[PDB]
Design a protein around this ligand. Structure first.
Ligand SMILES: Cc1ccc2c(c1)NC(=O)[C@]2(O)C(F)(F)F
Ligand SMILES: Cc1ccc2c(c1)NC(=O)[C@]2(O)C(F)(F)F
Lengths: 300, 237
């Protein structure tokens, strides 16, 4: 179990750690988060009390280094930093753990929610989507645009998700225009899976990461990416059977976790109705269809 | 974006553009089978592709053999239309290719966009105008070449005959749409108006009769009467 200490908490802020969150008051004696499960990526995220604008946060994996959060009063945000001097960092963490100034990652033992939302998400792939190679952790915020949104403006600050475009030469083989547009199996299986992602694990990892950025930061381009990757599978007549079964589990846990009050902005009516009721895979997502119908029947 | 009453005169500027109408591509007769079920029999159809500025009509005849062994023919017909329009564009010299293609039905947008991905600078547009191009098969010479075809064939016509020697393209299109709307609302009456007088003939190289300027005014008035009538006979007014 690992620890992300805080230098201090000089401004009142709501702090998220994965699907959990808590309020810290201005200058409260808060010194970080302990008992963080090893083996998973994690996200620590922030919304200031004075400006709920810009949610922002950091993806990290404690196996890759010792990370701490220090508030920067010039740039006005909580920043994640890396200490490579291990002896010095552990001396402080212990010193803090003794004074009980840390919140415990409050995982219920029965609970596989976080694993189920991050099963295929890997730090190495996150760092290719979010390019800032000098750090081992990745910053994301509500405003960052995707490479595809930039084609339709700062490239260093962009989310480099894999571009999916159903009306593109990449998606449509000459002479198979109707076939490839109405059945996207070529584009899914040859172009994207075999050609770009290499395997379905990497495809699901990017899909899961896009959903989590949409949910935790309200990042609109990430929501677009999540829905595009769902629709590409559902609009393919030929999909490996193990992929369909895994997608049903992935989406089930995503829909389960979504805040009920955010469904209006985070769920695209057209994509979900098309996917669940019209697409080739309309009968292949039993768990997802059942939770959607019982939790968000309005959208459908 | 979409073409409507506000941006009417754009049709007659000097940017090459084509209307594409697909309403006569897939044509059937519905009939009873010996068992008393219903079946369709396809008949030849056509894509109506028209330059509104010059009157050039590229009539691609769709022979019934193209449907043999195919499913979901109404969907296929939209993609076949887009395939043939794309082939037409590729066949034209670069300086004759259109800058815009306006489809008369919104269901043609995605098929045509996909077939034209190679031409990113050609704009594919819908329209809010209710154009009467479905009535093209009420023009006897056009119906005749479609029904006689034994194989796929493209035939070129000028749908304005020689009108542009005497009138503008705006006025020529206005007349064409008026004639076609009349033929669509009451074909028998419209054709009677057009041919009642045997001294006015259709030249061999023309589609419509050789009316004088004065006679076109009378004709046009007779068509505007027919349309207002049927609009009463229909709605009882
Ligand atoms: C927990 C914690 C707080 C602050 C720091 C570390 C670790 N590592 C550092 O280099 C330092 O920035 C410093 F300078 F204060 F020692
Ligand atoms: C552009 C334009 C304007 C007005 C008309 C047409 C075309 N064609 C017509 O028959 C007419 O409706 C009418 F009645 F006024 F002549």
């Amino acid at each position: 179990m690992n620890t992300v200490p805080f230098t201090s908490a000089p401004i009142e802020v709501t702090i998220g750690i994965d699907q959990y969150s808590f309020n810290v008051k201005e200058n409260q004696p808060f010194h970080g988060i302990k008992d963080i499960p090893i083996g998973h990526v994690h996200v620590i995220h922030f919304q200031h009390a004075d400006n709920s604008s810009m949610r922002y946060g950091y993806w990290f994996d404690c196996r890759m280094g010792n990370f701490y959060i220090q508030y920067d009063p010039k740039d006005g945000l909580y920043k994640m930093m890396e200490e490579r001097d291990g002896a010095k960092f552990e001396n402080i963490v212990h010193n803090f753990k003794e004074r009980q100034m840390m919140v415990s990652y409050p995982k219920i033992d029965e609970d596989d929610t976080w694993y189920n939302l991050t099963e295929f998400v890997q730090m190495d792939k996150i760092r290719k989507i979010v390019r800032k190679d000098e750090n081992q952790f990745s910053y994301v915020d509500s405003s960052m645009t995707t490479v595809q949104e930039n084609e339709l403006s700062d490239p260093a600050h962009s989310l480099n998700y894999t571009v999916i475009n159903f009306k593109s030469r990449e998606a449509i083989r000459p002479g198979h225009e109707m076939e490839d547009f109405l059945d996207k199996s070529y584009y899914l299986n040859t172009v994207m899976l075999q050609g770009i992602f290499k395997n379905s694990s990497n495809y699901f990892g990017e899909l899961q990461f896009a959903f989590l950025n949409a949910m935790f930061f309200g990042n609109y381009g990430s929501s677009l990416q999540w829905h595009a990757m769902i629709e590409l599978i559902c609009s393919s007549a030929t999909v490996p059977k193990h992929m369909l079964d895994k997608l049903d589990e992935i989406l089930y846990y995503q829909i389960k976790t979504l805040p009920e009050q955010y469904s209006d902005i985070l769920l695209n009516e057209r994509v979900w109705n098309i996917c669940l009721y019209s697409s080739f895979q309309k009968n292949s997502l039993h768990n997802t269809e059942k939770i959607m119908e019982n939790k968000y029947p309005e959208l459908l | 974006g979409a073409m409507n009453s506000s941006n009417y005169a754009e049709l007659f500027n000097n940017d090459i553009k084509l209307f594409v109408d697909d309403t006569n591509v897939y044509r059937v007769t519905v009939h009873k089978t010996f068992e008393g079920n219903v079946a369709t029999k396809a008949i030849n159809g056509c894509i109506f592709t028209l330059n509104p500025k010059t009157g050039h009509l590229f009539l691609k005849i769709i022979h019934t053999s193209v449907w043999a062994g195919q499913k979901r023919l109404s969907q296929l017909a939209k993609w076949k239309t887009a395939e043939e329009v794309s082939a037409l564009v590729r066949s034209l010299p670069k300086e004759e290719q259109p800058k815009q293609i306006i489809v008369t039905r919104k269901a043609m947008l995605d098929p045509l966009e996909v077939h034209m991905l190679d031409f990113p600078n050609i704009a594919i547009r819908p329209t809010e105008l209710r154009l009467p191009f479905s009535a093209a098969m009420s023009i006897d010479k056009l119906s005749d070449v479609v029904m006689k075809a034994t194989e796929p064939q493209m035939v070129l016509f000028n749908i304005y005959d020689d009108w542009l020697d005497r009138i503008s393209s705006y006025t020529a299109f206005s007349r064409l749409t008026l004639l076609l709307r009349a033929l669509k609302t009451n074909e028998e009456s419209a054709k009677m108006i057009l041919l009642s007088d045997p001294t006015i003939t259709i030249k061999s190289y023309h589609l419509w009769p050789s009316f004088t300027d004065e006679q076109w005014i009378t004709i046009e008035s007779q068509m505007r009467d027919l349309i207002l009538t049927e609009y009463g006979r229909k709605y009882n007014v």
